[PDB]
Short mmCIF file of C-alpha atoms in Angstrom, two decimals:
data_model
loop_
_atom_site.label_atom_id
_atom_site.label_comp_id
_atom_site.label_asym_id
_atom_site.label_seq_id
_atom_site.Cartn_x
_atom_site.Cartn_y
_atom_site.Cartn_z
CA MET W 1 -0.01 -0.01 0.01
CA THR W 2 1.37 3.42 -1.11
CA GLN W 3 -0.48 5.40 1.60
CA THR W 4 0.79 8.07 4.11
CA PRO W 5 -1.65 10.77 5.39
CA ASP W 6 -4.83 8.78 4.77
CA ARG W 7 -3.49 6.10 7.19
CA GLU W 8 -3.42 8.47 10.17
CA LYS W 9 -6.98 9.50 9.33
CA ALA W 10 -8.21 5.95 9.21
CA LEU W 11 -6.40 5.23 12.45
CA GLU W 12 -7.94 8.33 14.14
CA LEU W 13 -11.42 7.08 13.24
CA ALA W 14 -10.48 3.57 14.37
CA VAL W 15 -9.48 4.62 17.83
CA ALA W 16 -12.54 6.86 17.80
CA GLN W 17 -14.76 3.85 17.22
CA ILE W 18 -13.06 1.73 19.93
CA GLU W 19 -13.20 4.50 22.55
CA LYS W 20 -16.95 4.94 21.87
CA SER W 21 -17.81 1.30 22.58
CA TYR W 22 -15.28 0.19 25.20
CA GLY W 23 -14.55 3.46 26.88
CA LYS W 24 -12.11 6.38 27.00
CA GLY W 25 -8.88 4.69 27.94
CA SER W 26 -9.56 1.71 25.67
CA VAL W 27 -6.58 2.57 23.40
CA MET W 28 -3.89 5.20 24.01
CA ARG W 29 -0.29 5.95 23.29
CA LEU W 30 2.31 6.07 26.00
CA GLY W 31 3.16 9.63 24.93
CA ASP W 32 -0.39 11.03 25.20
CA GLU W 33 -1.03 13.91 27.53
CA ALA W 34 -4.77 13.74 27.32
CA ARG W 35 -7.49 13.77 30.03
CA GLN W 36 -7.64 15.82 33.27
CA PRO W 37 -10.80 15.65 35.41
CA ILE W 38 -12.10 18.08 37.97
CA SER W 39 -12.13 15.26 40.46
CA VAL W 40 -9.00 13.59 41.83
CA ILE W 41 -7.69 12.53 45.27
CA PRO W 42 -4.11 13.49 45.79
CA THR W 43 -1.84 10.56 46.81
CA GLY W 44 0.31 12.69 49.09
CA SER W 45 3.50 12.98 46.96
CA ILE W 46 3.56 15.13 43.78
CA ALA W 47 5.90 12.47 42.29
CA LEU W 48 3.20 9.87 42.28
CA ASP W 49 0.48 12.32 41.46
CA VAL W 50 2.05 13.10 38.16
CA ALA W 51 2.84 9.45 37.51
CA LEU W 52 -0.90 8.84 37.84
CA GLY W 53 -1.26 11.52 35.20
CA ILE W 54 -4.63 12.91 36.40
CA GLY W 55 -3.01 14.50 39.45
CA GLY W 56 -4.09 11.87 42.04
CA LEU W 57 -6.36 8.90 42.26
CA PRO W 58 -9.36 8.72 39.90
CA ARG W 59 -12.79 9.14 41.54
CA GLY W 60 -15.51 6.51 40.81
CA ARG W 61 -12.90 3.84 40.03
CA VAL W 62 -11.53 0.77 41.77
CA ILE W 63 -7.85 1.07 42.51
CA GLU W 64 -5.46 -1.77 43.49
CA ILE W 65 -2.33 -1.24 45.46
CA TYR W 66 -0.23 -4.33 45.90
CA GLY W 67 3.22 -5.22 47.08
CA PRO W 68 5.35 -7.12 49.69
CA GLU W 69 4.71 -6.93 53.40
CA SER W 70 6.34 -3.61 54.53
CA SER W 71 6.89 -1.36 51.47
CA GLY W 72 4.22 1.43 51.69
CA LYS W 73 0.83 0.22 50.43
CA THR W 74 -1.22 1.03 53.53
CA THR W 75 0.77 4.24 53.94
CA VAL W 76 -0.04 5.30 50.39
CA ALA W 77 -3.56 4.22 51.11
CA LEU W 78 -3.83 6.03 54.43
CA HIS W 79 -2.64 9.10 52.58
CA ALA W 80 -5.27 8.77 49.93
CA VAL W 81 -7.61 8.52 52.98
CA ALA W 82 -6.27 11.67 54.68
CA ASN W 83 -6.61 13.76 51.43
CA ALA W 84 -10.21 12.49 50.79
CA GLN W 85 -10.81 13.51 54.36
CA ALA W 86 -9.21 16.97 54.09
CA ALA W 87 -11.87 17.92 51.47
CA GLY W 88 -14.64 17.24 54.03
CA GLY W 89 -15.23 13.78 52.50
CA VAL W 90 -15.89 10.67 54.57
CA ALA W 91 -13.79 7.51 54.55
CA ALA W 92 -14.37 3.89 55.50
CA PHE W 93 -11.89 1.11 56.23
CA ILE W 94 -13.05 -2.45 55.93
CA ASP W 95 -10.51 -4.26 58.09
CA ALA W 96 -9.61 -7.91 57.69
CA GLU W 97 -6.05 -8.04 59.09
CA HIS W 98 -6.53 -6.31 62.41
CA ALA W 99 -3.41 -4.30 62.01
CA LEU W 100 -4.13 -0.62 61.91
CA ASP W 101 -2.12 1.86 63.96
CA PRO W 102 -4.43 4.83 64.61
CA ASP W 103 -1.53 6.89 66.02
CA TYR W 104 0.39 6.58 62.80
CA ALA W 105 -2.79 7.22 60.89
CA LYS W 106 -3.53 10.40 62.87
CA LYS W 107 0.02 11.52 62.15
CA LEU W 108 -0.54 11.15 58.41
CA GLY W 109 -3.62 13.40 58.85
CA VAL W 110 -6.41 10.81 59.20
CA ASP W 111 -9.33 12.06 61.18
CA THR W 112 -9.45 8.70 62.86
CA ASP W 113 -12.43 9.81 64.95
CA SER W 114 -14.69 9.88 61.98
CA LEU W 115 -13.12 6.96 60.24
CA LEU W 116 -15.87 4.40 59.69
CA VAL W 117 -14.01 1.13 60.42
CA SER W 118 -15.55 -2.32 60.16
CA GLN W 119 -14.04 -5.74 60.84
CA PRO W 120 -16.12 -8.45 59.01
CA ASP W 121 -16.51 -12.13 59.95
CA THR W 122 -16.23 -13.49 56.43
CA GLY W 123 -15.09 -12.11 53.13
CA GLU W 124 -18.41 -12.03 51.33
CA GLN W 125 -19.69 -10.00 54.25
CA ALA W 126 -16.80 -7.59 54.04
CA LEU W 127 -17.66 -6.81 50.40
CA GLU W 128 -21.37 -6.44 50.99
CA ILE W 129 -20.81 -3.99 53.92
CA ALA W 130 -18.59 -2.05 51.64
CA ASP W 131 -21.13 -2.49 48.90
CA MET W 132 -24.00 -0.84 50.66
CA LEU W 133 -21.76 1.56 52.37
CA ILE W 134 -20.79 2.50 48.83
CA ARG W 135 -24.34 2.96 47.54
CA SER W 136 -25.41 5.54 50.15
CA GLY W 137 -23.47 8.01 48.08
CA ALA W 138 -22.06 9.41 51.33
CA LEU W 139 -18.58 7.77 51.28
CA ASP W 140 -15.81 9.28 49.17
CA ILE W 141 -13.02 6.73 49.67
CA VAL W 142 -13.53 3.22 50.90
CA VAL W 143 -10.46 1.07 51.56
CA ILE W 144 -10.59 -2.74 51.95
CA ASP W 145 -7.50 -4.06 53.76
CA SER W 146 -6.12 -7.24 52.27
CA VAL W 147 -7.72 -9.16 49.54
CA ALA W 148 -5.75 -12.11 50.80
CA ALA W 149 -7.54 -11.99 54.15
CA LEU W 150 -10.99 -12.11 52.72
CA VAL W 151 -11.68 -15.78 53.47
CA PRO W 152 -15.10 -17.02 52.20
CA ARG W 153 -18.03 -18.27 54.34
CA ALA W 154 -17.54 -21.88 53.17
CA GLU W 155 -13.86 -22.05 54.06
CA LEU W 156 -14.63 -20.27 57.27
CA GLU W 157 -17.28 -22.89 58.04
CA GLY W 158 -15.52 -26.09 56.98
CA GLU W 159 -17.46 -26.89 53.92
CA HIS W 160 -13.26 -27.60 47.22
CA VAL W 161 -11.36 -24.37 46.32
CA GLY W 162 -12.03 -21.66 43.76
CA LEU W 163 -13.70 -19.59 46.56
CA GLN W 164 -11.95 -16.16 46.58
CA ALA W 165 -11.79 -16.12 42.79
CA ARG W 166 -15.58 -16.10 42.44
CA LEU W 167 -16.43 -14.29 45.64
CA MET W 168 -14.37 -11.41 44.25
CA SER W 169 -15.71 -11.59 40.73
CA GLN W 170 -19.37 -11.57 41.74
CA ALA W 171 -18.61 -8.61 44.02
CA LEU W 172 -16.47 -6.53 41.74
CA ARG W 173 -19.06 -6.75 38.95
CA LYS W 174 -21.84 -5.43 41.14
CA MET W 175 -19.53 -3.09 43.04
CA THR W 176 -18.14 -1.69 39.82
CA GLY W 177 -21.51 -0.19 38.73
CA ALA W 178 -22.23 1.25 42.16
CA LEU W 179 -18.80 2.91 42.22
CA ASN W 180 -19.06 4.38 38.72
CA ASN W 181 -22.43 5.80 39.73
CA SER W 182 -21.54 7.28 43.16
CA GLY W 183 -18.24 9.04 42.65
CA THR W 184 -16.65 6.87 45.35
CA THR W 185 -13.21 5.40 44.89
CA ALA W 186 -12.36 2.03 46.40
CA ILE W 187 -8.78 0.98 47.17
CA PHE W 188 -7.86 -2.68 47.44
CA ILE W 189 -4.69 -3.61 49.28
CA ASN W 190 -3.41 -6.79 47.78
CA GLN W 191 -0.46 -9.21 48.14
CA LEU W 192 2.27 -9.42 45.38
CA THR W 193 -4.52 -13.62 45.51
CA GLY W 194 -7.98 -12.38 44.48
CA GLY W 195 -6.10 -12.30 41.19
CA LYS W 196 -7.80 -12.01 37.82
CA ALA W 197 -10.99 -10.33 38.87
CA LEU W 198 -9.37 -7.41 40.61
CA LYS W 199 -6.62 -7.28 38.04
CA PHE W 200 -9.21 -6.54 35.34
CA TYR W 201 -11.96 -4.52 37.02
CA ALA W 202 -9.40 -2.13 38.49
CA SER W 203 -8.80 1.11 36.56
CA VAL W 204 -5.50 1.71 38.33
CA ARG W 205 -3.01 -0.83 39.73
CA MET W 206 0.03 0.20 41.68
CA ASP W 207 3.10 -1.89 42.52
CA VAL W 208 4.64 -0.41 45.62
CA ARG W 209 8.08 -1.60 46.73
CA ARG W 210 10.73 -0.47 49.19
CA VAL W 211 13.86 0.53 47.34
CA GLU W 212 16.29 1.57 50.09
CA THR W 213 16.27 2.00 53.84
CA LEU W 214 16.79 5.75 54.09
CA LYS W 215 20.06 6.36 55.96
CA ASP W 216 19.55 9.24 58.36
CA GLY W 217 23.22 9.37 59.26
CA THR W 218 22.15 7.65 62.42
CA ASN W 219 19.82 4.63 62.09
CA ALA W 220 17.02 5.28 59.57
CA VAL W 221 14.50 8.17 59.25
CA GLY W 222 12.45 6.40 56.53
CA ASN W 223 12.45 4.31 53.32
CA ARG W 224 12.65 5.12 49.72
CA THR W 225 9.54 3.70 48.11
CA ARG W 226 9.01 3.15 44.42
CA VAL W 227 5.56 2.76 42.85
CA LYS W 228 4.96 1.49 39.38
CA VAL W 229 1.55 1.98 37.91
CA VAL W 230 1.14 -1.11 35.78
CA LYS W 231 -2.44 -0.21 34.83
CA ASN W 232 -4.09 3.10 34.23
CA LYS W 233 -7.31 3.55 32.13
CA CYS W 234 -7.07 7.17 33.03
CA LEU W 235 -3.67 7.86 31.44
CA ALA W 236 -0.68 6.43 29.65
CA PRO W 237 0.44 3.42 31.85
CA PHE W 238 3.72 2.12 32.98
CA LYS W 239 4.80 5.35 34.67
CA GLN W 240 6.67 5.36 37.97
CA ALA W 241 7.45 7.37 41.08
CA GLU W 242 9.82 7.23 44.07
CA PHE W 243 9.26 9.05 47.32
CA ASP W 244 10.36 8.80 50.93
CA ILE W 245 8.16 7.35 53.69
CA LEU W 246 9.52 8.52 57.05
CA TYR W 247 9.19 6.24 60.07
CA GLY W 248 6.21 7.51 62.02
CA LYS W 249 5.73 10.44 59.63
CA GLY W 250 4.64 8.89 56.33
CA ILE W 251 5.43 10.19 52.83
CA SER W 252 7.61 13.30 52.93
CA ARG W 253 5.58 15.83 50.85
CA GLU W 254 8.44 18.26 51.22
CA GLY W 255 10.94 15.64 50.00
CA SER W 256 8.87 15.35 46.83
CA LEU W 257 8.84 19.10 45.99
CA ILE W 258 12.62 19.11 46.13
CA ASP W 259 13.04 16.02 43.94
CA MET W 260 10.46 17.33 41.50
CA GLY W 261 11.76 20.89 42.01
CA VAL W 262 15.24 20.03 40.71
CA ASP W 263 14.06 17.73 37.90
CA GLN W 264 12.11 20.67 36.59
CA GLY W 265 14.65 23.41 36.95
CA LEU W 266 12.53 25.19 39.59
CA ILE W 267 15.09 24.23 42.21
CA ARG W 268 18.79 24.37 41.52
CA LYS W 269 21.35 22.14 43.20
CA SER W 270 24.68 24.01 43.24
CA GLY W 271 26.74 21.18 44.79
CA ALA W 272 25.40 20.07 48.14
CA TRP W 273 23.47 23.35 48.07
CA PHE W 274 19.79 23.76 47.21
CA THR W 275 18.62 27.07 45.85
CA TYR W 276 15.29 28.30 44.66
CA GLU W 277 14.67 31.45 42.66
CA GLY W 278 17.62 33.33 44.16
CA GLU W 279 17.63 32.34 47.81
CA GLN W 280 19.09 29.18 49.32
CA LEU W 281 16.78 26.56 50.81
CA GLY W 282 19.52 24.71 52.55
CA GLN W 283 22.59 22.49 52.52
CA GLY W 284 21.50 18.88 51.94
CA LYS W 285 18.21 17.30 50.81
CA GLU W 286 17.05 16.88 54.42
CA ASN W 287 18.07 20.44 55.27
CA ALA W 288 15.95 21.80 52.45
CA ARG W 289 13.25 19.32 53.37
CA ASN W 290 13.29 20.75 56.89
CA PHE W 291 13.43 24.24 55.52
CA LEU W 292 10.40 23.64 53.28
CA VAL W 293 8.42 22.09 56.11
CA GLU W 294 9.00 24.98 58.49
CA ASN W 295 8.29 27.44 55.69
CA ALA W 296 5.00 26.16 54.19
CA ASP W 297 4.50 29.49 52.41
CA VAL W 298 7.36 28.75 50.07
CA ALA W 299 6.77 24.93 50.01
CA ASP W 300 3.38 25.15 48.26
CA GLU W 301 4.88 27.87 46.00
CA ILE W 302 7.03 25.20 44.44
CA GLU W 303 4.20 22.71 44.38
CA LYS W 304 2.13 25.40 42.70
CA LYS W 305 4.67 26.21 39.98
CA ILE W 306 5.20 22.61 39.16
CA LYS W 307 1.49 22.04 38.97
CA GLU W 308 1.29 24.92 36.53
CA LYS W 309 4.10 23.42 34.36
CA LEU W 310 2.12 20.18 34.18
CA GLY W 311 -1.21 19.69 36.07
#
């Protein structure tokens, strides 16, 4: 075929036809900039917010955060809970592992007092409680802790396998419509279990892993986490982000502005020195981090400028 411009026109229509019938993110190009809603729940680190593309987590979708035991996951999730909360929204936490540290959560900014928490007897139950809690159109973010811990009635009774992968499927189908119709975003912490089902219904899927144990000079102030969004029907996939999660403090927002500040020219590193638009922030990443945290006025100035240079 001798073609050239007529090809790009047939392809444009093609994609058009696919998008129409299977949805917006049905086909995309890794270089696309497209889409940007009015609704998004910040993750807590600008780094990850841009990797997600839409500036945070998509509302009305089912998100899946998975990873090894002790990388971030819950932290990242608790953050998405604190931010949904900071906009006067209400959060729920269906708990099946019995491992939540309210003190840590309150430190991340979770209004633990108004945190609807429930600890189900079986897995099916856990989904239903989250299902009707979802349908009241009152909840903004609902997090289900551990898909692996959602044991089914049968197994919990004695009465073989193929339980979870069924229990989840039946749920996700039904729960997917309710979600897309309520503007609520559900986060599933997973082990990397419920497998397939969640892997496909989910609009976003994040692989969180602990890169390095942040050397504080002394012992360790935090950990350098790395998320890799393997699935994103909201924007070009396969993007990644690294951020610090300080022991007891959570994700360093300030540490993200610096990292993103330099990689965008907004902050200049003149050899051990960090400078921003004339004046020096400090000597060392942690110094500047501490500078930015004590001086919020300038901290969100950087966040602002970088959000203007992207979105």
